[PDB]
Write an enzyme that holds these catalytic residues in place. Structure first.
Site, short mmCIF file in Angstrom:
data_model
loop_
_atom_site.label_atom_id
_atom_site.label_comp_id
_atom_site.label_asym_id
_atom_site.label_seq_id
_atom_site.Cartn_x
_atom_site.Cartn_y
_atom_site.Cartn_z
N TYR A 1 4.75 -5.36 -0.47
CA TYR A 1 4.54 -4.43 0.63
C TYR A 1 3.08 -3.99 0.68
CZ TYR A 1 4.32 -0.44 -2.57
OH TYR A 1 3.96 0.45 -3.56
N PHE B 1 -3.42 2.96 2.24
CA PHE B 1 -3.24 3.85 1.09
C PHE B 1 -2.48 3.22 -0.07
CE2 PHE B 1 0.71 4.66 3.37
CZ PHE B 1 1.64 4.77 2.36
N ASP B 2 -1.79 2.10 0.13
CA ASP B 2 -1.11 1.46 -0.99
C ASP B 2 -0.91 -0.02 -0.70
OD1 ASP B 2 0.02 1.18 -3.47
OD2 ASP B 2 2.00 1.92 -2.88
N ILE C 1 11.85 6.40 -0.78
CA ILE C 1 12.04 7.22 0.41
C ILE C 1 13.06 6.56 1.33
CG2 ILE C 1 9.76 8.26 0.26
CD1 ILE C 1 8.72 6.28 2.19
N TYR D 1 8.32 12.14 3.10
CA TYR D 1 7.48 13.19 2.52
C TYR D 1 7.39 14.46 3.37
CZ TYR D 1 6.02 9.60 -0.79
OH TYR D 1 6.01 8.63 -1.76
N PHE E 1 4.48 0.26 7.34
CA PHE E 1 4.64 -0.63 6.20
C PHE E 1 4.75 -2.07 6.68
CE2 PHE E 1 6.23 3.38 4.45
CZ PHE E 1 5.54 3.43 3.25
#
Lengths: 107, 49, 242, 685, 79, 48, 174
Positions: free
Chosen positions: A26, A36-37, A56, A82, A99
């Site tokens: 991912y 961010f990731d 999540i 979140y 994503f």
């Protein structure tokens, strides 16, 4: 909820069932376009079990609808990921997440 | 991810250089207002899909 | 019994006498026309020229210079000892309160024209220079002396709220840096609004590494790490990648 | 833009370097959660790419190396270094095989084969490392949940990291060997310092294997260890890191010597005790075992002392081992010669400027010259345990390393919970009361005292004081040596015992009482200043009202009865031992008391104070009226104060045989005591 | 007769007390002679003395312990 | 006002005095016993 | 020595031992260098520290002896011997200048008289020895501990007497 758009088609028959483990790659970025990731940077696929509140909500709901080998894109609203608290130092409050998910193997 | 786009370009303004550029670099077809490209899912122009 | 004293102390005492007289006259002159808009006035005691206070401030700045870093060890130690003694004497006689009062009196005016509206055009050409010299002399007075720096523990807001001012920003930043370096105890009273004000200063005045040094100085207190400060800095500076 | 373009844009370079410095600053000293957050701004691939980039400006290279070290490797290295000063060897078959020299005897020359430092088998106990994998899609935990576990630390592949570090160090050595005009980073210091720092950290953490250690040793000096790095021309900054590496290797040598000594001890004891059993079977034995082992070893002089019954072969084994130990230290080409020559040459060549380099190099030289003294000084720490207790010891260590991690951090509620849990876990372990000498050697009571000192120095956290006090009392209740060790903090404990609350639970006064109780030698060593301080506290208590009682809405009383009882009981413990009185302490206490009459309370005042019987009857009447009472009751406290005072005064009385001998001091003291309390009052009570 | 680990601990302490302390060393003179060479600006011994003097002359409220100074002073005294 | 004080005030500036003879020429001469004088405070510039 | 400010410990003992080692035999060059440095610096810390160190030397104690007997009397004798040996070696060789400097420091703001301090310590030691003899007068035989205590006390007294003799051996009339 979550919106799913197909990038590359998959098997179309096999789907994740209860009690199995999903192995995925991912990449996650904010709505503004800032990454961010990413699990490909660490060169290790991510592994999680469905139905055990490990991740999540939106990630699980998106992964539940994908077939084996499919590559798709998911969008998550703030109330699913979140909420209004965010992730301290990573994600600001009230953020919408995008994503890019590929499903590699089941169990 | 791998990059691959096909389209038309104009001689006067289309001039990509290796390295940096607009946005996060990697400028190709459709990253300015002098080229018009396609990649299978999106129409790219002005660095916008 | 009669005891002879060193010439350095006598020189310091004479300078203190003259400087205190001049600055008290200046303060009275400033307080003369408070709230009375007119084209005439006496900013000094009896309308003395404003170049005298500028020259006195420059001389005092020259007086408190730190020793050169290229000297020998023992000479550097002796010079530091003498500088500390002179700073202690000047603080004890009460020049710090005089400088603070002068700054407080001058702070009510935001620009040269606003000052000339009360003191005339003939006296408004030295306002910015006087403010800069006052901040510089305060910074030179409090540098390296933790006893002097301890006086600011209860007036942190008075120092923080002036970072917005755009006439002498560098002097205020230097004073804050010196205060934070010398007295780590003040790290226990920092709150969120001060950190947000510093970050807003960074946003408004451009990319400057002195602000980064100031932010770095707020994390460790003489060997122990002060989490809150770290948590607030991380939460307020990092997530918005701008 | 390309980052390398910062080679000519100086302002951006300065800003980015200071930004990296801030990144390091916000993560310092155990900020594991902030490290996990930072792992998303500078990811693993960027760090691994920047480690190998040869065109980066020097400041950015150093900043990125430091950022990697601070994010991933600082805390585990700190803990491991903090627990490297102690040797614990388990008695295992692996331990028995350890020998000072390699087994090969084909070479019989002087040097024999010394062996490479840091290569071989070691059995000293050291807990492992713990890490966590970063992830930013995990579900949020229980919001606001207190007593949450520690945040652990971000993870990173270690084998690839160490292979990369070895490759980069070799490349740097080759680059520096050719005298190139374009050093990496713009200078030799920028080329060499970060790689040496990373290598030293990885070596200390214990990642490298035998082959990697051999490669590093060959890089240091190819000739000695089967162009070289030590014989190049370097500035001071590189020399500091070189000194650090040499220090690590010397520490490894010392550890090897200690382990070999322990193995020989095990084998020798196993051989000797069976012979002792057989000799006793064939047939002095009334001596304690320590005296026996002392007597059995009394043949160092080389003569056949008839006082020892040891046969020839056992003495031969011991003498051979002693000779081998002597020749191993060089008392009777190698690492010691190389280090000494290098340090002397460095000192001769130039006038050193940095004090730290001078201190490090002279410490290295002193360690190299005096080989045997270092081993002599290191022995008082070593310890041996049965192999069955290993799993119990490790856990205790993991507890101790926890507390040391929380002493460099500002204090908070979660920190309080973790401290309390760790101290309880340590108290619950069984080996804590099976090997007290090991516990004293580790010096954990010093750590607990440091925690208490930090907390006490209007208190904010009252629970930790009680926890530390009860832990210290339990520690004191174990052995005489622990009591004597704790006795040395009596002045500080009494200095901080004058708190006005008292009713928090356990208090340092209890720690002092446990330190002094029922020890004749310790009681006789008591100083008079402590007694005077206690008496002053008692007088102050007897002059003023109780604050907490008044705060709860109690009737006003001119003195504090619930307070002085603690000081009276401490004095009672100080005076009476094992059913007999100590004359000196009793005389001192009585003489101190008589000069401050207000310690006796209102009853024994000469200026109109009614006797004991009247005030006891008044207290009895008070206890019948709820209005004058009201947990703590007034009458009970008033009764208890005088009961304790009378008990102490009765225990201060002299012995009978002293009165029989007719000594004046005892008669004087008894006359004073009789004058204080009339007989009719006792009979009425 | 007795647990092995305790016996090993008493053996270690007895061996330390009896055999190790009896040995003698005379490295002080050799170390001083080596440090006094300055062969091929002060010699290394001069630098050591200057460093200790600098440490002594600093302004502080108390003199903290320094094991390096004690060891080297013992070596110089025995030399 | 004028006071007697001890302690660190022995090293502060407010404990310094200056002696001025009534003579103008040769005012640096050694003081005679019974010679009239003025005493001045250095920091405040006042005469007792 | 000046930096210790009168606090006893291991550092001062090592410093005294090193000084005794380099001053053995009455080396004139070392004495000259020390005197020149002392007269140049004009510091008062040195003699104040010496006086403070002298005022804390211990003597025979009878109550502590009784306490130990019912079951540390003179534990710092070696330090006292080292201190007085250092002073004697400072005055060794009939060096008049150092004797006069030890009696009175001319150039300093304050002065300390070491000879009187030595006399005071001698008086204290003599009183302690007299008390010990008074304690042991009645007994018929003396136990070993008393013998060893007497031996160490007399060993200290010998050094004190030698230090005084070296003080007045000039002849230094002052």
């Amino acid at each position: 909820g979550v919106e799913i758009e197909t990038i590359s088609p998959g098997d179309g028959r096999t789907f994740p069932k209860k009690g199995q483990t999903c192995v995925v790659h991912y990449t996650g970025m904010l709505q503004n376009g800032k990454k961010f990731d990413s699990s490909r940077d660490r060169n290790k696929p991510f592994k999680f079990r469905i139905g055990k509140q490990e991740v999540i909500k939106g990630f699980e709901e998106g992964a539940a609808q994908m077939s084996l080998g499919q590559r798709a894109k998911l969008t998550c609203t703030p109330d699913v990921a979140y909420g209004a608290t965010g992730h301290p130092g990573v994600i600001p409050p009230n953020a919408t997440l995008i994503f890019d998910v590929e499903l590699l193997n089941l169990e | 991810a791998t990059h691959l786009r096909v389209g038309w370009a104009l001689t006067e303004g289309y001039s990509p250089y290796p390295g940096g550029g607009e946005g996060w670099g990697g400028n190709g077809v459709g990253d300015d207002l002098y080229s018009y490209g396609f990649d299978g899912l999106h129409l790219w122009t002005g660095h916008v899909p | 019994s009669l005891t002879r004293c060193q010439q350095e102390e006598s020189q310091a005492a004479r300078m203190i006498y003259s400087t205190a007289g001049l600055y008290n006259h200046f303060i009275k002159g400033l307080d003369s026309f408070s709230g009375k808009p007119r084209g005439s006035g006496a900013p000094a005691g009896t309308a003395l020229p404003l170049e005298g206070v500028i020259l006195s401030l420059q001389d005092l700045i020259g007086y408190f210079e730190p020793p050169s870093e290229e000297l020998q060890h023992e000479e550097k130690q002796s010079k530091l000892r003498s500088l500390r003694n002179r700073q202690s004497l000047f603080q004890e006689e009460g020049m710090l309160s005089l400088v603070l009062n002068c700054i407080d009196r001058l702070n009510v005016y935001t620009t040269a024209a606003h000052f000339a509206e009360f003191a005339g055009e003939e006296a408004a050409e030295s306002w910015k220079e006087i403010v800069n010299l006052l901040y510089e002399i305060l910074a030179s007075l409090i540098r390296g002396n933790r006893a002097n720096c301890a006086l600011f523990s209860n007036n942190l807001d008075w120092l923080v709220s002036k970072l917005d001012r755009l006439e002498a920003s560098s002097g205020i930043l230097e004073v804050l840096y010196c205060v934070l370096i010398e007295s780590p105890e003040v790290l226990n009273i920092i709150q969120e609004n001060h950190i947000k004000s510093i970050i807003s200063l960074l946003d408004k005045h451009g990319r400057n590494h002195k602000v980064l040094d100031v932010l770095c100085s707020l994390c460790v207190c003489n060997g122990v790490a002060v989490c809150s400060n770290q948590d607030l800095i991380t939460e307020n500076l990092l997530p918005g990648r701008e | 833009m390309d980052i390398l373009e910062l080679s000519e844009r100086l302002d951006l370079q300065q800003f980015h370097s200071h930004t990296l410095r801030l990144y390091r600053a916000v993560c310092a000293l155990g900020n594991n959660r902030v490290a996990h957050a930072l792992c998303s701004h500078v990811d693993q691939a960027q760090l691994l790419h920047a480690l190998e980039d040869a065109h980066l400006p020097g400041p950015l290279r150093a900043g990125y190396y430091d950022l990697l070290i601070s994010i991933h490797l600082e805390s585990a290295c700190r803990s491991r270094r903090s627990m490297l000063s102690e040797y614990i060897v388990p008695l295992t078959p692996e331990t028995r095989a350890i020998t000072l020299f390699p087994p090969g005897k084909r070479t019989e020359n002087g040097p024999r084969r010394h062996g490479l430092p840091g290569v071989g088998v070691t059995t000293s106990l050291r807990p492992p490392h713990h890490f966590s994998a970063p992830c930013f899609v995990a579900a949020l935990p229980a919001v606001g949940a207190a007593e949450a576990p520690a945040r652990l630390s971000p993870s990173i592949p270690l084998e690839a990291l160490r292979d990369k570090a070895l490759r980069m160090l070799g490349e740097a050595v080759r680059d520096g060997g050719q005298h190139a005009r374009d050093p990496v980073g713009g200078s030799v210091e920028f080329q060499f310092v970060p790689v040496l720092k990373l290598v030293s950290t990885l070596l200390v953490m214990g990642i490298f294997g035998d082959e990697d250690v051999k490669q590093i040793l060959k890089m240091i000096e190819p000739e000695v260890f089967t162009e070289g790095l030590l014989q190049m021309k370097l500035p001071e900054s590189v020399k500091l890191q070189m000194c650090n590496l040499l220090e690590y290797f010397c520490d490894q040598e010392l550890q090897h010597r200690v382990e070999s000594l322990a193995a020989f001890a095990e084998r020798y004891v196993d051989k000797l005790q069976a012979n002792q059993r057989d000799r006793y079977g064939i047939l002095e034995f009334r001596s304690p075992p320590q005296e026996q082992i002392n007597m059995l070893l009394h043949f160092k002089d080389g003569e056949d002392e008839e006082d020892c019954p040891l046969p020839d072969e056992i003495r031969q084994d011991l003498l051979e081992f002693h000779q081998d130990l002597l020749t191993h230290c060089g008392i009777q080409q190698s690492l010691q010669e190389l280090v000494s020559h290098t340090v002397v040459r460095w000192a001769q060549e130039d006038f050193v400027q940095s004090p730290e380099l001078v201190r490090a190099m002279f410490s290295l030289l002193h360690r190299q010259y005096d080989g045997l003294g270092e081993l002599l000084r290191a022995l008082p720490r070593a310890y041996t345990i049965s192999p069955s207790s290993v799993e119990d010891t490790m856990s205790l260590l993991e507890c101790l390393g926890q507390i040391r991690s929380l002493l460099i951090v500002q204090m908070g509620p979660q920190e309080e919970n973790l401290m309390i849990q760790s101290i309880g876990n340590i108290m619950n372990n069984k080996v804590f009361y099976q090997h007290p000498n090991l516990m004293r050697a580790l010096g954990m009571h010093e750590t607990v005292m440091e925690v208490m000192v930090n907390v006490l120095g209007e208190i904010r956290f009252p629970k930790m004081v009680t926890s530390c006090c009860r832990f210290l009392c339990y520690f004191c209740r174990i052995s005489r040596q622990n009591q004597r060790s704790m006795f040395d903090h009596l002045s500080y404990l009494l200095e901080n015992s004058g708190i006005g609350l008292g009713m928090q639970g356990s208090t340092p006064l209890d720690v002092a009482a446990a330190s002094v109780i029922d020890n004749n030698e310790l009681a006789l060593a008591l100083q008079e200043q402590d007694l005077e301080k206690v008496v002053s506290y008692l007088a102050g208590c007897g002059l003023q009202s109780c604050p907490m009682l008044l705060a709860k809405g109690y009737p006003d009383i001119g003195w504090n009865p619930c307070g002085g009882e603690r000081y009276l009981d401490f004095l009672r413990f100080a005076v009476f031992v094992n059913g007999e009185s100590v004359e000196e302490n009793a005389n001192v206490v009585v003489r101190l008391l008589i000069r401050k009459p207000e310690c006796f309370g209102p009853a024994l005042r000469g200026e109109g104070g009614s006797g004991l019987l009247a005030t006891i009857e008044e207290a009895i009447r008070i206890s019948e009226d709820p209005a004058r009472d009201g947990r703590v009751h007034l009458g009970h406290a008033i009764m208890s104060f005088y009961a304790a005072l009378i008990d102490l005064l009765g225990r201060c009385a002299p012995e009978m045989h002293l009165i029989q001998a007719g000594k004046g001091e005892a008669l004087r003291i008894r006359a004073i005591l009789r004058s204080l309390v009339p007989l009719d009052d006792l009979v009425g009570i | 007769n007795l647990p092995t680990h305790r016996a090993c601990n008493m053996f270690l302490e007895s061996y330390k007390a009896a055999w190790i302390l009896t040995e003698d060393h005379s490295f002080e003179d050799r170390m001083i002679d080596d440090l006094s060479k300055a062969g091929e600006k002060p010699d290394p011994l001069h630098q050591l003395v200057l460093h200790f003097s600098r440490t002594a002359l600093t302004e502080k409220s108390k003199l903290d312990e320094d094991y390096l100074y004690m060891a080297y002073a013992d070596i110089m005294a025995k030399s | 006002l004028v006071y007697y004080e001890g302690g660190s005030v022995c090293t502060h500036a407010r404990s310094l005095w200056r002696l001025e003879p009534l003579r103008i020429s040769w005012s640096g001469s050694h003081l005679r016993w019974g010679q009239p004088l003025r005493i001045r405070h250095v920091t405040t510039g006042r005469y007792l | 020595i000046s930096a210790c400010k009168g606090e006893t410990g291991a550092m001062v003992s090592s410093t005294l031992k090193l000084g005794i080692s380099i001053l053995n035999g009455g080396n004139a060059d070392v004495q000259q260098k020390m005197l020149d440095y002392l007269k140049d610096k004009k510091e008062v810390g040195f003699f104040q520290s010496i006086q403070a160190l002298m005022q804390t030397c211990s003597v025979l104690d009878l109550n502590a002896f009784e306490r130990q007997n019912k079951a540390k009397v003179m534990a710092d004798d070696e330090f006292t011997q080292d201190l007085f040996r250092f002073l004697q070696l400072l005055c060794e060789g009939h060096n008049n200048d150092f004797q006069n400097y030890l009696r009175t420091q001319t150039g300093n703001t304050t002065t300390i008289n070491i000879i009187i301090c030595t006399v005071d310590y001698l008086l204290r030691l003599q009183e302690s020895i007299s008390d010990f003899y008074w304690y042991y007068s009645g007994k018929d035989v003396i136990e070993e501990q008393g013998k060893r205590n007497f031996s160490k006390a007399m060993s200290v007294a010998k050094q004190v007497f030698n230090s005084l003799t070296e003080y007045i051996q000039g002849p230094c009339t002052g």
